[PDB]
Symmetry: C3
Subunit: 269 residues, 3 copies
Amino acid sequence: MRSFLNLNSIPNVAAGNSCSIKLPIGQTYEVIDLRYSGVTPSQIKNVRVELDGRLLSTYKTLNDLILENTRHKRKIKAGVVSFHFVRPEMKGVNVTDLVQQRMFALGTVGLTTCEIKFDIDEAAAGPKLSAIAQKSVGTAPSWLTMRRNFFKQLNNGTTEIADLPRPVGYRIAAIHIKAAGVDAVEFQIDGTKWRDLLKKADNDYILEQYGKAVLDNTYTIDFMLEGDVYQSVLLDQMIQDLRLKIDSTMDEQAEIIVEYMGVWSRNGF
Amino acid sequence: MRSFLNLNSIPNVAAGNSCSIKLPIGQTYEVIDLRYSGVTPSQIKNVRVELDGRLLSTYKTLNDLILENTRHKRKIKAGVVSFHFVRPEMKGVNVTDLVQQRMFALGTVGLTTCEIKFDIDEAAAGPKLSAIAQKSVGTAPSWLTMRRNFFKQLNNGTTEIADLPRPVGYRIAAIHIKAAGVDAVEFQIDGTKWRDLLKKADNDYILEQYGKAVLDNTYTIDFMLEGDVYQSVLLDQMIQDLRLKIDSTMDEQAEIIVEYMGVWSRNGF
Amino acid sequence: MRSFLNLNSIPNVAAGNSCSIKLPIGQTYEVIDLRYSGVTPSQIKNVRVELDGRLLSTYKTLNDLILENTRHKRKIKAGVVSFHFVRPEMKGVNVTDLVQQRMFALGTVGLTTCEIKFDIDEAAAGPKLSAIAQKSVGTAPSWLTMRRNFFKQLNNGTTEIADLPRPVGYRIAAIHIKAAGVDAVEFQIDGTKWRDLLKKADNDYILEQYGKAVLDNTYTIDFMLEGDVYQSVLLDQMIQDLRLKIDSTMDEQAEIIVEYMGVWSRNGF
Ligand SMILES: [Ca+2]
Ligand SMILES: [Ca+2]
Ligand SMILES: [Ca+2]
């Protein structure tokens, strides 16, 4: 049996303020529903999910969480944005789908602090935020999704990005290139071309082919289209080159979103 | 291999008549498609599913079966209403999804009588009813869904309902509060608040979050949102208090629908 | 990890030409995305999937592949048509859904030639065709879907078709009767009526009930509505009669599509 709780009131919710959603340790957080009003998702900046003071996932703005859910075609409602720790799209290969989905839940056992920090923009009309938690029996943090932010400049022609962090033992579920002039992209590991120079229209067709929604000004490289976690990129230590070849038509700075995965560690990624 | 059969003609289908769909014993009924015309679903009153003369499930009107299917976002077609014994939304935890869904099928082995009784309203224009059965190999009644009806007066303020039947060994998949002025509800068992006083808007958001459709003038407490049968309320013999705290804005009569579950017994619930 | 490749250019793509998509042997083809322009799907005739020179699946026109995907409610996009070897609708009974779906992938190991032949109509405006492959680790051809074409005369009244090929050990996933005047159909094996004389409206309701789309001028007999491969017709070497009783209202020649299934054999069906 799951428990639906109305989280404690968020302290000091005001424009230009730096607030935090301190989660009580002990149980597992499958989903966290954040209700907002008097402020836009884009006005909720620097969203960070921290476990024991260490960064887990980061969102430039709350709007990126809305887009993250939209991509998987999850239920979107105005005035509310959810933090889906449990991945509903997961499919089991040697275990049930339910087990594969719940494995991403935010367990808090052994944790000292679980927080969701963010800053309220100064222009916020009259910010009002509350949260509801869909919890289950306690478990260790364990397997978690680690959304990381990276900013790289793009040229008009070809741009190569090979300096992406490769935490050993971790995996890469997907890579999102946020740019308005990306025509085609190619992904390779150690010379091996896992993703040919696919045109945007072709890449976007495959995405939609798997029930995903194409995000505006974004080139998504989904490594878990089938929902199989073992299809994701395994950051094996012996890997010598993890490269991305981007064919752009504009000279701009792109925001590269990398969805990492791995067993959460006190001293890990 | 399944068998699709055109059930025998329904005897005496006329306005103001009391008809019955007598099902032949021997096999398993996964789904029963009831075609209707010259009558409205609301004109088909007191729908009772009886096994060996005992009541299994009850519907005030056929319209409640239409709403039951609509809630799960099942295919709805005008002129036809189906009895989904097999629950398509079920997900397996230690077994396959298919096994978890088919486990609810209406097995008839060992039964003496299997009937679907109902009364045709007098205002019925020109009632015409036929049925089709989607069957499979015979099995005992076994695990079945037992829809029960309850009527309780709801006040403007706070009302508490703790006298709901607690058949030992049985489970509760969901509870539907049919009232027009329900603002928030709270569910608890033995003091433990499994469902905080959740506002309708918040409760309805979680429901939709799991692919469910919100029913008009209804507050649904779904204990199987994930499709996992083990998330439902297990009516343990030791439970001392099963309470519901309803915050209404109107003084009215609510129809409380309780979806029970358990292994069918000739002398059980 | 899967590999998305831009297949080699299709040789001699012109109106009235006979082209072929020669697939490199070694890996497994889960899906093949065929992009087309300057030609209609109906202008791409006699589509044949050949393994070692032998016929596996056949499509009168590329439009039949579009309808095949539409029926399962797969993502349809103008200018592109995919060959879904892996069946996304598959559900596991004693194995995971993923295993049951991927089991249909087009493995090429041990093969000498893998081709997708077709003829470009003479009326083609300015045909332009390219292909992309979603591949995975190599496997033998193994379990494959074998779409077969049959033409039979339907009468206005009742027609019976009992001369359908019954390859031993193979299965039948579905049968599609392409005719404009089919009212009802009945399916039986050895006298046993597995599908009663179901009216089109009733048959089509069950189809939609399982997330399928009804095709125009087609009576589909889906034996895998639940996604369970074990629900399909097992062509037992002991079946004496496999009959189809069609109640038509027109006198026309129907195109009977039979989706066979079985482990591909160099000297088999
Ligand atoms: Ca976890
Ligand atoms: Ca049962
Ligand atoms: Ca295969």
